[PDB]
Amino acid sequence: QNRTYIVTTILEDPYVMLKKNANQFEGNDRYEGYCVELAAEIAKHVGYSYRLEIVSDGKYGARDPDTKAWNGMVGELVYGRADVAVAPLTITLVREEVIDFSKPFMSLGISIMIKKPQ
Amino acid sequence: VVTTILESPYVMMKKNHEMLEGNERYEGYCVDLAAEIAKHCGFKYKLTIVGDGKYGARDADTKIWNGMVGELVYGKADIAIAPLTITLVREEVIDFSKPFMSLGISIMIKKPQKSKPGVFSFLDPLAYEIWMCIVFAYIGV
Amino acid sequence: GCDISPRSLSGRIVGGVWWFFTLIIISSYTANLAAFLTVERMVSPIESAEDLSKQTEIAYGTLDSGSTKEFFRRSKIAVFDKMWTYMRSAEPSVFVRTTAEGVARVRKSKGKYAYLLESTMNEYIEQRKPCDTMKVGGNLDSKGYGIATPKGSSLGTPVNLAVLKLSEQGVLDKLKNKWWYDKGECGAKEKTSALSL
Amino acid sequence: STKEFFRRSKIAVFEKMWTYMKSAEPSVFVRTTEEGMIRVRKSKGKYAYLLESTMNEYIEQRKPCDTMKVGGNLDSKGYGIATPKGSALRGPVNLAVLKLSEQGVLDKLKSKWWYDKGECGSKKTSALSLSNVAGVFY
Amino acid sequence: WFFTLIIISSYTANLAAFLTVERMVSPIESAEDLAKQTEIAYGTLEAGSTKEFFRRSKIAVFEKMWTYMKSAEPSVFVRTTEEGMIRVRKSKGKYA
Ligand SMILES: NS(=O)(=O)c1cccc2c1c([N+](=O)[O-])cc1[nH]c(=O)c(=O)[nH]c12
Numbered sequence: 001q002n003r004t005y006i007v008t009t010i011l012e013d014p015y016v017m018l019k020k021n022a023n024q025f026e027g028n029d030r031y032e033g034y035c036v037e038l039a040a041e042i043a044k045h046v047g048y049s050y051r052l053e054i055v056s057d058g059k060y061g062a063r064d065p066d067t068k069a070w071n072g073m074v075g076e077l078v079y080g081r082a083d084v085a086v087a088p089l090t091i092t093l094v095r096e097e098v099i100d101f102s103k104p105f106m107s108l109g110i111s112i113m114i115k116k117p118q
Numbered sequence: 119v120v121t122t123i124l125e126s127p128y129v130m131m132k133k134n135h136e137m138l139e140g141n142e143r144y145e146g147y148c149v150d151l152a153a154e155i156a157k158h159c160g161f162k163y164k165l166t167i168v169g170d171g172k173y174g175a176r177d178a179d180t181k182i183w184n185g186m187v188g189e190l191v192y193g194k195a196d197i198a199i200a201p202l203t204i205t206l207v208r209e210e211v212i213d214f215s216k217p218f219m220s221l222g223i224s225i226m227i228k229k230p231q232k233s234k235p236g237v238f239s240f241l242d243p244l245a246y247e248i249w250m251c252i253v254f255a256y257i258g259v
Numbered sequence: 260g261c262d263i264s265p266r267s268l269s270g271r272i273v274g275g276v277w278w279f280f281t282l283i284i285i286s287s288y289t290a291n292l293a294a295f296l297t298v299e300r301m302v303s304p305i306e307s308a309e310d311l312s313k314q315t316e317i318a319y320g321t322l323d324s325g326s327t328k329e330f331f332r333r334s335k336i337a338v339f340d341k342m343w344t345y346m347r348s349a350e351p352s353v354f355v356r357t358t359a360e361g362v363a364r365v366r367k368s369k370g371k372y373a374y375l376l377e378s379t380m381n382e383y384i385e386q387r388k389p390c391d392t393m394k395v396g397g398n399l400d401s402k403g404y405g406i407a408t409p410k411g412s413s414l415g416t417p418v419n420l421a422v423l424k425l426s427e428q429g430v431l432d433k434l435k436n437k438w439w440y441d442k443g444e445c446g447a448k449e450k451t452s453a454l455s456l
Numbered sequence: 457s458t459k460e461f462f463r464r465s466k467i468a469v470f471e472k473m474w475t476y477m478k479s480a481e482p483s484v485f486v487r488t489t490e491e492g493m494i495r496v497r498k499s500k501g502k503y504a505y506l507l508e509s510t511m512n513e514y515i516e517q518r519k520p521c522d523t524m525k526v527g528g529n530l531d532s533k534g535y536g537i538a539t540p541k542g543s544a545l546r547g548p549v550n551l552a553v554l555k556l557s558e559q560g561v562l563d564k565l566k567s568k569w570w571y572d573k574g575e576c577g578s579k580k581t582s583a584l585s586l587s588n589v590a591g592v593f594y
Numbered sequence: 595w596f597f598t599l600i601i602i603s604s605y606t607a608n609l610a611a612f613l614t615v616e617r618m619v620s621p622i623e624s625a626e627d628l629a630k631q632t633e634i635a636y637g638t639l640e641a642g643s644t645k646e647f648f649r650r651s652k653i654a655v656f657e658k659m660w661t662y663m664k665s666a667e668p669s670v671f672v673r674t675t676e677e678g679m680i681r682v683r684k685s686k687g688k689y690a
């Protein structure tokens with residue numbers, strides 16, 4: 001049987017959230033969000049079964065300047081813990097050297113937030 | 119053997135390009151980009167043009183790629199530096215970089231002008247409802 | 260004035276309140292007219308795409324036999340489905356054979372045609388002489404322009420890292436400013452005119 | 457990444473922003489994003505936050521819907537799907553992402569989880585309105 | 595009576611507009627005021643220390659001036675100083 005591929009994610013609404021009555025459902029069925037359906041479609045097109053989880057550190061990848069060790073989903077990827085990451089990973093030079101990204105599924109930018117004029 | 123296309127403001131021929139010989143007559147965005155890319159990679163380049171479609175595509179019958187994509191597939195060039203759109207069909211036969219410029223579809227309109235004043239533009243300072251309330255307040259008074 | 264004024268308290272009450280009403284209303288009319296004549300404000304009829312679908316006075320079309328039409332055709336969003344219905348049931352042909360044809364069609368008309376195109380060329384043209392066009396609303400799709408390479412070339416990883424480094428430091432933004440806004444003819448007060456007949 | 461982007465900026469406008477930035481607000485900066493949102497909500501329009509556009513839209517569509525996103529995007533970046541170096545899930549994943557983007561799946565999911573689940577809504581004349589002169593009629 | 599009301603109100607309002615606008619007018623008093631606006635063109639001698647100073651400038655405002663400079667005036671620049679003085683005198687405030 002083709003091995004289940006381990007997917008790393010992170011809690012950040014709406015990308016990944018816990019479905020109402022989490023204890024009721026187990027496994028992937030308890031997770032609801034944009035990234036979950038994206039992973040569903042991607043695995044459907046590739047044709048592999050996946051099991052979700054969450055980065056315990058709860059932080060996006062970053063290296064310790066002195067320890068030279070990655071802290072986050074990048075770590076769970078480059079250290080063999082995880083087989084793919086489906087989350088809002090910003091594309092950067094530091095990560096692109098030690099990780100193989102994909103063409104952006106969501107373009108993005110810095111923007112201005114103000115009080116809604118009553 | 120880089121490649122490019124005259125679509126402005128990416129590639130254009132500098133004023134008095136007869137004086138310029140080669141790789142210095144061209145100007146634009148893609149050319150400066152190729153300069154910086156070569157600088158960060160080291161290799162030397164000679165800007166060129168292809169024509170014959172001006173961009174990548176495929177003929178379903180001939181099954182032969184045309185343009186920058188066609189020449190990259192067949193070795194006529196090293197890389198293509200140009201406003202070349204990322205697409206599924208092309209990535210299957212070549213390899214892209216991460217986008218150097220993201221964009222999307224948008225709406226172009228003619229700039230609103232000072233509208234020619236309309237007959238009965240002297241009522242504009244007050245809303246129609248105010249005028250009708252004025253009429254009926256006159257009646258009621 | 261008046262050839263008669265009321266003598267009873269009730270008629271005088273009515274007249275007084277009418278007088279107050281008249282005073283306020285005339286003052287307001289004059290003041291708001293002064294505002295109008297002092298500050299020119301030209302409102303674009305459109306600030307989005309739904310506004311464009313609801314409107315029927317304004318016509319809009321893409322370039323015929325292109326990727327934009329292919330996008331609108333295979334769409335699943337409601338607004339773009341409505342736009343596709345319109346463009347498929349439009350007389351005359353909203354579509355066009357060349358970009359310059361669409362630009363000319365927009366410019367010749369007066370607020371009747373709206374052209375759907377790429378953000379970059381639109382931004383460029385909004386800075387060309389004649390500066391008689393502008394871009395409105397956001398973007399209806401996401402795309403990117405990418406450096407290409409043959410399968411197996413040793414230049415893939417270096418160019419990827421080069422574009423990423425340039426983006427992070429800010430070179431590409433500077434080049435865009437240089438070739439779109441700078442090197443741009445029109446950048447980004449007129450004495451008041453006497454009223455005409 | 458925003459502080460670094462402004463600090464390391466070679467553009468005129470963002471250079472001016474950075475010159476203003478680090479001033480005596482006392483603290484224009486913040487530690488938590490929720491902190492910035494709360495600070496903007498409390499301020500009576502006296503604070504403006506700089507953040508990723510996606511979160512700005514999501515917040516704009518969240519109850520009480522008392523904030524808005526304004527202007528274009530200062531920078532341009534992207535979110536991607538990561539696989540470890542030398543993996544068999546590189547080409548297929550990229551192809552799948554691109555196919556989804558052309559098919560319109562990603563935009564539909566965006567609309568669904570940003571607007572079709574927003575607490576708030578979906579979406580002029582300087583002429584004097586009857587509300588301005590109501591007291592006269594009363 | 596209606597005609598009179600409209601006409602007198604329009605006269606008063608447009609006169610207020612005239613005077614208000616005539617009161618907004620802030621003339622040029624610095625390099626910045628000249629820099630942002632473009633209704634007036636400004637150019638220096640073709641060859642001289644001023645052209646070099648602007649070209650080789652690391653300041654924001656003069657950088658913007660140089661970006662504007664070398665534009666299609668057609669020729670903001672000049673060859674002789676007397677030429678510049680005459681050009682400014684002939685221009686009805688359209689050259690600085
Ligand atoms: N990899 S990342 O690049 O780590 C990153 C990835 C994904 C979302 C991020 C984010 C960062 N950031 O910069 O720290 C800040 C941030 N701030 C918000 O307010 C928000 O909603 N999302 C984010």
Ligand SMILES: NS(=O)(=O)c1cccc2c1c([N+](=O)[O-])cc1[nH]c(=O)c(=O)[nH]c12
Pocket residue numbers: 125173174201202203325326327358376377380
């Ligand atoms: N790869 S591409 O996709 O070939 C393509 C690449 C680059 C610019 C394009 C363009 C296409 N097109 O669709 O044909 C149409 C088009 N139309 C405009 O008006 C404009 O300014 N730029 C373009």
